[PDB]
């Protein structure tokens, strides 16, 4: 039972690997190839920066 247990564990860490892949393409989805999207994110971002700065 403990042996099998260890297999299970190994898959549970691999699992985290799966999260990172997932996240990554989630963040990749922030790209769209739409120029006006890229502009919106931009201004947001720079405004955010000035906010933080104070």
């Amino acid at each position: 039972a403990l042996f099998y247990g260890d297999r299970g564990l190994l898959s549970g860490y691999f699992g985290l690997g799966g999260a990172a892949r997932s996240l990554g393409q989630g963040l990749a989805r922030l790209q769209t190839g739409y120029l006006r999207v890229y502009a919106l994110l931009f201004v947001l971002g720079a405004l955010l920066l000035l906010g933080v700065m104070r």
């Binding site: 769209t32 190839g33 120029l35």
Partner: peptide, 10 residues
């Protein structure tokens, strides 16, 4: 149309 240029994308 600016958003009719869209093949480069993530």
């Amino acid at each position: 149309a600016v958003d009719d240029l869209s093949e480069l994308r993530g």
